[PDB]
Amino acid sequence: GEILCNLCTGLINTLENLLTTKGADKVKDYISSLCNKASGFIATLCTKVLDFGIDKLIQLIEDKVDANAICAKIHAC
């Protein structure tokens, strides 16, 4: 893989400092803009997170799921 993980796993980590308090709405707002750059091999990768749940990815972290484990999850690496 290693297509655009740095992007995901990179943003994921940002989600940890993003809001994680305000509401977590701006998360899907920012994750969209970012995820809004696939339309290709990541196509399914993008819809992957959506299919999974942007909030979910954040939920995993809450538990103890790194930005990678959370990524590799939906298969982004």
From Swiss-Prot:
Source domain of life: Eukaryota
Subcellular location: Cytoplasmic granule
Main location: cytoplasm
Single GO biological process annotation from the record: defense response to bacterium
Keywords: Antibiotic, Antimicrobial, Disulfide bond, Signal
Coiled-coil residue spans: none
Keyword field contains Disulfide bond: yes
Field pH dependence: Optimum pH is 5.2.
Domain spans labelled Saposin B-type: 1-77
Membrane spanning stretches: none
Record site: Essential for homodimerization: 75
Keyword Acetylation: no
Cystine crosslinks: 5-77, 8-71, 35-46
Free-text function comment from the UniProt entry: Forms pores in the cell membrane of host cells. Has antibacterial activity against M.luteus, no activity against E.coli. Implicated in the cytolytic activity of the parasite.
Known partners and oligomeric status: Monomer (at pH below 4 and pH above 6). Homodimer (at pH 4-6). Hexamer; formed during insertion in the membrane.
Protein name per UniProt: Pore-forming peptide amoebapore A
